[PDB]
């Protein structure tokens, strides 16, 4: 959960990616319970970045890409049609 971009690799499992696994399971802004990064938010590909964030590049489809479609394996500046996974763009904040 660093910033629009953490890009929690989100790649390393079928359930989900590595299986959203840090920073509330995602990386991209969260804060731990120590603010570290495990509580808070993963760069809600909110109406700000819209790209300047980014992790994957193809998991929407319901039976082909990394698979998400709903919100569990998409990229970083997207919004699963609107929950923060697949629909937006993907672009990473360096």
CA dihedral 6, 12, 14, 19 (to 10 degrees): -50
Are 53 and 94 found together in one domain?
yes
CA distance 13 to 2: 21
Are 62 and 92 found together in one domain?
yes
Are 73 and 94 found together in one domain?
yes
CA distance 4 to 61: 23
| 3-class SS of residue 92 | strand
CA distance 67 to 62: 6
Range of the domain at 88: 44-94
CA distance 12 to 68: 14
Quick one: which H or E segment has residue 33? Answer: none
CA distance 44 to 6: 12
What is the DSSP code (8-state) at residue 54? -
């Amino acid at each position: 959960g660093s910033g629009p971009t953490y890009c929690w690799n989100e790649a390393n499992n079928p359930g989900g990616p590595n299986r959203c696994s840090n920073n509330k399971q995602c990386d991209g802004a969260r804060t731990c319970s120590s603010s570290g990064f495990c509580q808070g938010t993963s760069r809600k590909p909110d109406p700000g970045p819209k790209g300047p964030t980014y992790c994957w590049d193809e998991a929407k489809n319901p039976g082909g890409p990394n698979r998400c479609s709903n919100s569990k394996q998409c990229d970083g500046a997207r919004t699963c049609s609107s929950s923060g996974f697949c629909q937006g763009t993907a672009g990473h904040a360096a």
